[PDB]
Amino acid sequence: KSVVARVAEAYPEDVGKRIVRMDKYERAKLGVSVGDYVEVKKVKSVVARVAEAYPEDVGKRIVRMDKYERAKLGVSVGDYVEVKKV
Domain map (residue ranges) of the chain:
2-85
Contacts of 50 (CB under 8 A, 6+ apart): 19, 20, 21, 22, 27, 32, 33, 34, 35, 36, 37, 38
Contacts of 1 (CB under 8 A, 6+ apart): 30, 84, 85
Contact 3, 86 (CB under 8 A): no
Contact 66, 55 (CB under 8 A): no
CA distances (Å), origin 74, targets 39, 40, 69, 80: 15, 12, 9, 11
Q: Which CATH number fits domain 2-85: 3.40.50.2300, 2.40.40.20, 3.30.70.260, 1.10.150.530?
A: 2.40.40.20
